[PDB]
């Protein structure tokens, strides 16, 4: 049942061409949420596939069963320990959003690479889904770590 999840992670990763860094089965145990979001960079709002696992966020370009087997092209990853997430209020337009107007969005800084971007969901409910999952992943990760220091004598 634990191993079955690892096998699913391995399957997913095999559909992502251009994978960089450690394997999903080395650092993750499950996929918590996946979905399409708009990612903002200079002169680009681009649709990207986002995947939140325990310990890792990954974003990819979606390829339109594929002919060659791969369904996504790797774009980036963030260890959730170095991922700083902040809310963006609707209507905000500033240098963090590359001059674009944000609705149903949020900002992510990756402090391992000193890179940032803004994400937008299509609806408020979808933003709340993403934020809730981001909070749950952090809470669980902090709950594990601490639990394992509080379980020092057991
Ligand atoms: Ni900043």
Coordinates of C-alpha atoms and ligand atoms in Angstrom, one line a residue:
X1 CA 0.0 0.0 0.0
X2 CA 3.0 2.3 0.7
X3 CA 4.9 0.6 -2.1
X4 CA 1.9 1.0 -4.4
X5 CA 2.1 4.8 -4.0
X6 CA 5.8 4.7 -4.8
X7 CA 5.1 2.8 -8.0
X8 CA 2.5 5.5 -8.9
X9 CA 5.1 8.2 -8.3
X10 CA 7.6 6.3 -10.5
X11 CA 5.0 6.0 -13.2
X12 CA 4.2 9.7 -13.2
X13 CA 7.8 10.6 -13.3
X14 CA 8.4 8.4 -16.3
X15 CA 5.9 10.6 -18.2
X16 CA 7.9 13.7 -17.5
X17 CA 10.7 14.3 -20.0
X18 CA 13.7 16.4 -19.0
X19 CA 13.4 15.5 -15.3
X20 CA 16.1 17.1 -13.1
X21 CA 17.2 16.2 -9.6
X22 CA 16.4 13.3 -7.3
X23 CA 13.6 10.9 -8.1
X24 CA 10.1 11.1 -6.6
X25 CA 10.5 7.7 -5.0
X26 CA 13.7 9.0 -3.2
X27 CA 12.0 12.1 -1.5
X28 CA 8.2 11.8 -1.7
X29 CA 5.5 9.3 -0.6
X30 CA 2.4 10.7 -2.3
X31 CA 0.9 13.3 -4.7
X32 CA -1.3 15.7 -2.6
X33 CA -2.7 17.9 -5.4
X34 CA -2.3 18.4 -9.1
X35 CA -3.8 21.0 -11.4
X36 CA -3.3 23.6 -14.1
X37 CA -2.4 27.1 -13.1
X38 CA -1.3 30.2 -14.9
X39 CA 2.4 31.0 -14.2
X40 CA 3.7 34.6 -14.6
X41 CA 7.1 35.5 -15.9
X42 CA 8.3 38.6 -17.9
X43 CA 6.0 38.9 -21.0
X44 CA 4.4 35.5 -20.3
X45 CA 1.3 34.2 -18.7
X46 CA 1.7 30.5 -19.4
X47 CA -0.5 27.6 -18.5
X48 CA 1.6 25.0 -16.5
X49 CA 0.8 21.7 -14.8
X50 CA 1.6 21.9 -11.0
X51 CA 2.1 18.9 -8.8
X52 CA 2.3 19.2 -5.0
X53 CA 3.8 16.1 -3.3
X54 CA 4.9 15.7 0.3
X55 CA 8.3 17.6 0.4
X56 CA 8.2 18.8 -3.3
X57 CA 6.5 21.2 -5.7
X58 CA 7.0 20.5 -9.4
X59 CA 5.8 22.5 -12.4
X60 CA 5.7 21.3 -16.1
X61 CA 4.5 22.2 -19.5
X62 CA 1.7 20.0 -20.5
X63 CA 2.0 18.2 -23.9
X64 CA -1.4 17.9 -25.7
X65 CA -2.0 8.4 -24.0
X66 CA 0.6 10.4 -26.1
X67 CA 2.4 9.2 -29.1
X68 CA 5.9 9.1 -27.5
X69 CA 4.7 8.2 -23.9
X70 CA 5.8 11.5 -22.2
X71 CA 2.9 13.8 -21.1
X72 CA 4.8 16.7 -19.6
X73 CA 8.0 18.6 -20.0
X74 CA 9.8 19.3 -16.8
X75 CA 10.1 23.1 -16.0
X76 CA 11.1 23.3 -12.4
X77 CA 10.9 22.0 -8.8
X78 CA 11.0 23.4 -5.3
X79 CA 11.8 21.6 -2.1
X80 CA 8.8 22.7 0.0
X81 CA 11.2 23.5 2.9
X82 CA 12.7 26.3 0.9
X83 CA 9.3 27.4 -0.7
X84 CA 7.9 30.7 0.7
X85 CA 4.3 31.2 -0.3
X86 CA 2.4 34.6 0.1
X87 CA -1.1 35.7 -0.7
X88 CA -1.7 38.3 -3.4
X89 CA -4.8 40.4 -3.2
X90 CA -7.1 40.6 -6.3
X91 CA -6.3 43.5 -8.5
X92 CA -2.6 43.8 -7.5
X93 CA -0.1 44.6 -10.3
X94 CA 3.5 45.1 -9.3
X95 CA 7.1 44.0 -10.1
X96 CA 6.5 40.6 -8.4
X97 CA 3.7 39.9 -10.9
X98 CA 5.9 41.2 -13.8
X99 CA 3.4 44.2 -14.2
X100 CA 0.4 41.9 -14.8
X101 CA -2.9 42.1 -12.8
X102 CA -3.4 39.3 -10.4
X103 CA -6.7 37.6 -9.7
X104 CA -7.0 34.5 -7.5
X105 CA -3.2 34.4 -7.2
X106 CA -0.3 33.9 -4.9
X107 CA 3.5 34.4 -5.0
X108 CA 6.2 31.8 -4.5
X109 CA 9.8 32.4 -3.7
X110 CA 12.3 29.5 -3.9
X111 CA 15.1 30.5 -1.4
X112 CA 17.4 27.7 -2.6
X113 CA 17.6 29.3 -6.0
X114 CA 16.6 32.9 -5.3
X115 CA 13.8 32.7 -7.9
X116 CA 10.2 33.7 -7.7
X117 CA 7.0 33.6 -9.6
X118 CA 3.3 34.3 -9.3
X119 CA 0.6 31.6 -9.9
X120 CA -3.1 32.2 -10.7
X121 CA -6.0 29.9 -10.6
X122 CA -9.0 30.4 -12.7
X123 CA -11.4 30.7 -9.7
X124 CA -11.4 31.7 -6.0
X125 CA -12.5 28.2 -5.0
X126 CA -9.5 26.7 -6.9
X127 CA -7.1 29.2 -5.2
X128 CA -8.5 28.1 -1.8
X129 CA -8.0 24.4 -2.8
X130 CA -4.3 25.1 -3.6
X131 CA -3.7 27.2 -0.5
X132 CA -5.4 24.6 1.8
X133 CA -3.2 21.9 0.3
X134 CA -0.1 24.0 0.7
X135 CA -1.0 24.6 4.4
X136 CA -1.7 20.9 4.9
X137 CA 1.6 19.8 3.4
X138 CA 3.5 22.3 5.6
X139 CA 1.5 21.3 8.7
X140 CA 2.1 17.6 8.1
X141 CA 5.8 18.1 7.4
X142 CA 6.2 20.2 10.6
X143 CA 4.0 17.7 12.6
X144 CA 6.2 14.8 11.4
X145 CA 9.6 16.4 12.2
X146 CA 8.4 17.5 15.7
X147 CA 6.5 14.3 16.5
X148 CA 9.8 12.5 15.8
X149 CA 11.7 14.7 18.3
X150 CA 8.8 14.4 20.8
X151 CA 9.0 10.6 20.2
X152 CA 12.7 10.6 21.3
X153 CA 12.1 8.4 24.4
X154 CA 9.4 6.0 22.9
Ligands
LIG1 NI1 10.6 39.1 -3.8

